[PDB]
Amino acid sequence: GLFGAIAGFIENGWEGMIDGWYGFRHQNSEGTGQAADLKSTQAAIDQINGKLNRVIEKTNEKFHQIEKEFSEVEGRIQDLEKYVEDTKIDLWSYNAELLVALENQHTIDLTDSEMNKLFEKTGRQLRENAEDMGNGCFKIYHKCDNACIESIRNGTYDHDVYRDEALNNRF
C-alpha cells in the first residue's frame, strides 16, 4: 500500500487478532497479551461501510424499454436497436470494472493508512520513552506493567512519569 505499513514494515497480519482489525501485542514483566484497538478498527470499518453503502445504493428503475432479442432478420432498424444496446452494456461494463478497481485500490490504501496512523499515534504518546524497532514494534525503555500498557492502549499514558527511567535506560 501507499503507506507501507500493511504488507510493509508490519511483516504480516495476525491471524489471531479476531476481535479487531488493528491492535496491540505486548510482552512485559507480567507476561504477554493482546487487545484490539477500537478507534482504528472502527475507522476502517466505517469508511468501508460508508463506501459499500454508496456503491449498493439506489439501482435505477426502468419499465418499458426496447426489445433486445429478435426472432427475424430485419436489417437497419434492428441493427440500430442491437448496436445501441450492445454499446450501453459495454459502457456499463467498463463503469463496473472501473468502479471496483478504484474502490479496491482505495479500500487497500485507506486500511494501510489506518495501520500507519495507529502506529504514529502510539509513537507520539511514547515521546522519548520508546524506540521504533522498525517492524511495527516499540521497545519501551522502562518497567511497564499491564496497567501501564493499558494506559498506552486507552490513550492516557503519561510519558513524564516514566521519562527519567526511560532515558537512563536508553542512553
Binding site: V73, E74, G75, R76, I77, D79
Partner: protein
C-alpha cells in the same frame, strides 16, 4: 469488391458474376464500383445490403 457493389454481385450483374457463391469476413466496396445491368432501385437498399453483408 473491385468494380462491384455487394448488391451488384448479389443480383448477378454480369461484370460482377466472378463473385458468385463467394464468402467473406469483410467485403470491401470500392468507390469506383459501378452498375452495368438493368437500371434498378432497392426499397430499403441499406437494409438488404446490411443483411446480406452480415
Amino acid at each position: 469488391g473491385i468494380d462491384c457493389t455487394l448488391i451488384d454481385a448479389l443480383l448477378g450483374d454480369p461484370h460482377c458474376d466472378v463473385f458468385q457463391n463467394e464468402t467473406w469476413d469483410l467485403f470491401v466496396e470500392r468507390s469506383k464500383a459501378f452498375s452495368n445491368c438493368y437500371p434498378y432501385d432497392v426499397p430499403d437498399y441499406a437494409s438488404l445490403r446490411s443483411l446480406v453483408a452480415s
